[PDB]
Amino acid sequence: MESADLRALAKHLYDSYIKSFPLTKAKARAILTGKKSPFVIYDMNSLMMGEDKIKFKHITPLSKEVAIRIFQGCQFRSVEAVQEITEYAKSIPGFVNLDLNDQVTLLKYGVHEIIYTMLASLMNKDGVLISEGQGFMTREFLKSLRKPFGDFMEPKFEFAVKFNALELDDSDLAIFIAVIILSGDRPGLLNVKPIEDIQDNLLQALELQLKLNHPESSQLFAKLLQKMTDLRQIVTEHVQLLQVIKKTETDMSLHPLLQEIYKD
Amino acid sequence: HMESADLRALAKHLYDSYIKSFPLTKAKARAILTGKTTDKSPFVIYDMNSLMMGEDKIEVAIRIFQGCQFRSVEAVQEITEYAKSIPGFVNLDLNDQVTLLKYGVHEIIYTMLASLMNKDGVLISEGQGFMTREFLKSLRKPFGDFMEPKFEFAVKFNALELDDSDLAIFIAVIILSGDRPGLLNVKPIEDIQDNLLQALELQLKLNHPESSQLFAKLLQKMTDLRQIVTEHVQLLQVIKKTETDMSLHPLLQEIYKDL
Ligand SMILES: Cc1cccc(C)c1C(=O)n1nc(-c2ccc(C(=O)O)cc2OCc2ccccc2)c2cc(Cl)ccc21
Ligand SMILES: Cc1cccc(C)c1C(=O)n1nc(-c2ccc(C(=O)O)cc2OCc2ccccc2)c2cc(Cl)ccc21
């Protein structure tokens, strides 16, 4: 037997995922379903009030055009999330023992996929939690931002809605995020073997986890792995979309040091 | 939710049908590629002269492109016939049958093309010829770099060491994908797929007992399939805007028409 070891690994990852991330899926769902009401941002006037009252970092002026300020706010939050994911990664058994350059490579090419996944935990069909659950910004507001910005937001919701239909919880997600990080096919890896060995363990752990936590949900393991397809696809789209924005928009300028920090 | 004996029954059914539908199996392709036999030896095409001589025994970049296109159309036909054998498939809504094939055929062609490849080239003309990777990769203009990604994929996929019995179930899983755009009734597709996935999982554990998480590693390859089918389309579009000298079979045109 090694069931106990797989459960040990699951528990280890769950405990660490709780410590590393500000707002769990469990907490975010309580807020979204309406089980300390979040401040709601559904239009320009309500944004003005929220930033004036709740004082949201990421959406506070440092460009004066709202659509840009919100776009940049997403960029800023994603960079903050990279540090959370980084810290989480260090807790995955075997990860810190990898070649240092491979650690960096794994995080570099994994973070986009992870941020999409985890963003779904904070979204439903009607909008997204921000500032650790204190704010709730509506899908319609985001989707109706002008020019390319509105069309940049909506794909994230489309993805989340489909992902959320699997009804994963945090104990499930902790293992799934681990699997994503330990992907042996990232470009420029020096030593793939020990990465795939760790991944094989995480996959075993995720499989057992899903059978016990969702015994009625046939082939959930397979369905979840199939979602890596949608993850890679949307990360590719993401890059194409940013580039068009870079080429087109003249008014995106921040202080150079900010650009450096939030270069992403 | 299915008993083992039924999962084994379904694997046997699909293997049998794969054999009937596809002329050149992986098992036959490997026997040809590894050689050590007198009767099954391919003529090898590695340059212009050898191409000339190959036609006698069995613009160049266009001729080869058209060669690939022609085989691909044949492959669609073979895949379509295999699909009809998959329990439940013909029972689906007819529009959904079309949709499943439309999105699925390209992924399957790449999968099955890998069976005919090693790192040095690809079987052609039902195993009678072998064209080298170096020759294909050195075709001019856009054509060379349209050939090479096929090999890049095959080398990785072939590392899993699937056999035909395995691939029959894997191909079936690809076709019955409930996430294809425009599907009208996802539920009955996903119910068939869940059976195929159970069948694949048991098949892999029995046929490759020492190969840990082969199931998962195989599903992860559906990711690479989706990516390369997408790049394919982008690349073919760019070809279709330099090359009027090259035209596309209606069947493939239609498959591409709105992907
Ligand atoms: C820029 C980026 C790089 C990599 C991955 C993604 C998805 C993006 C991106 O385009 N994003 N990223 C958020 C976002 C992500 C994670 C969290 C969190 O708390 O875990 C929060 C996020 O956004 C909160 C937010 C929403 C609106 C304004 C400011 C912050 C994201 C969110 C949306 Cl709605 C759209 C695109 C997003
Ligand atoms: C044009 C096309 C449309 C749709 C799908 C694909 C992959 C292509 C394409 O770019 N292809 N397609 C082959 C090919 C596929 C399947 C078989 C087989 O027998 O099952 C054979 C194939 O090629 C045989 C061949 C190779 C060289 C010369 C003449 C025939 C394909 C093969 C390569 Cl090496 C590169 C691109 C290919």
- One-letter amino acid for residue A234 of the chain: I
A-B C-beta contacts closer than 8 Å: 41
Place of tokens 């939050």: A77
The Cα–Cα gap between A221 and A127 comes to 27
d(CA B244, CA B248) in angstroms, rounded, equals: 10
Alpha helices in B58-118 (DSSP H): 60-85, 94-114
Q: Is B66 annotated as a binding residue?
A: no
B212 interfacial to chain A (CB closer than 8 Å): yes
Assign domain A2-264 one CATH number from 3.40.640.10, 1.10.565.10, 2.60.120.380, 1.50.10.10. 1.10.565.10
DSSP string, chain A: --HHHHHHHHHHHHHHHHHH-SS-HHHHHHHHHT--PPEEE-SHHHHHHHHHHT--TTSS-----HHHHHHHHHHHHHHHHHHHHHHHHHTSTTSTTS-HHHHHHHHHHHHHHHHHHHHHTTB-SSEEEEGGGTEEEEHHHHHT-THHHHHHHHHHHHHHHHHHTT---HHHHHHHHHHHHT-TTSTT-S-HHHHHHHHHHHHHHHHHHHHHH-TTSTTHHHHHHHHHHHHHHHHHHHHHHHHHHHHH-SS----HHHHHHT--
Domain layout of chain A by residue ranges? 2-264
Which is the closest atom of ligand 1 to the Cα of A75? 1
Distance of CA A217 to the CA centre of its chain: 24
Phi, psi of A183 (to 5 degrees): -95, 120
In whole angstroms, give the CA distance from residue A111 to residue A129.
20
Exposure b/e, B141-178, CB count within 10 A at least 16 = b: eebeebbeebbebbeebbebebebbbbbbbbbbbbbbb
Ligand 1 near A70 CB (within 6 A): yes
Q: Which of A83, A113, A115, A151 to mutate to test ligand 1, by most ligand atoms within 8 A of the CB atom?
A: A115
The method recorded for this entry reads X-ray
Who's near A237: CB < 8 A, 6+ residues apart? A155
**Chain-chain contact of A229 with B230 (C-beta, under 8 angstroms):** no
Nearest to A237 by CA among A134, A129, A151, A170: A151
Question: Given the structure tokens 């709202």, which residue do they identify?
Answer: A66
Instruction: Specify the resolution in Å.
Output: 2.1
Contact A218, B190 (CB under 8 A): no
- Ligand 2 site residues (CB inside 6 A) read B 64, 67-69, 71-72, 75, 106, 109-110, 112-113, 116, 122, 124, 131, 136, 147, 150, 252
Which ligand is closest to the CA of A72, given by its number?
1
Closest to A166 measured CA to CA, from A221, A129, A206: A221
CA angle B72/B91/B250 to nearest 5° reads 25
What count of Cα atoms within 13 Å lies in the side-chain half-sphere of residue B75? 25
DSSP code of B129? E
Quick one: tokens of A210? 């899903």
Relative to beta strand A135-138, strand B121-124 is unpaired
The separation between CA B62 and the C-alpha centre of its own chain, rounded to angstroms, equals 22
Residue A114 C-beta-side C-alpha neighbours within 13 Å: 29
Type of residue found at B107 = E
Q: Which distant-in-sequence residues (6+ apart) come within 8 Å of A134 by Cβ?
A: A38, A39, A54, A56
Instruction: Phi first, then psi: give them for residue B89, nearest 5 degrees.
Output: -65, -50
State how far the Cα of B154 lies from the Cα of B144, in Å rounded to an integer. Answer: 16
Question: First-to-last CA distance in chain A?
Answer: 44
For B82, which DSSP code?
A: H
Fold assignment, B3-259: Retinoid X Receptor (1.10.565)
| Segment (H or E) for B46 | none
> What would the 3-class secondary structure string for A67-82 be?
HHHHHHHHHHHHHHHH
Spatial neighbors of A105 by CB under 8 A, at least 6 apart, are A186, A187, A188, A189
The residues after which chain B has a C–N gap greater than 2.5 Å are 58
Joined together, the tokens standing for residue A120 give 């779904």
Torsion of CA B104, B253, B153, B198, to 10 degrees: 0
- Sheet of A127-130, strand order: A39-41, A135-138, A127-130
The encoded tokens of residue A191 equal 């030593």
B182 burial via Cβ count (<10 Å: 0-12, 13-18, 19+): exposed
Residues in contact with B112: Cβ distance below 8 Å, sequence separation at least 6, in sequence order: B22, B75, B167, B171
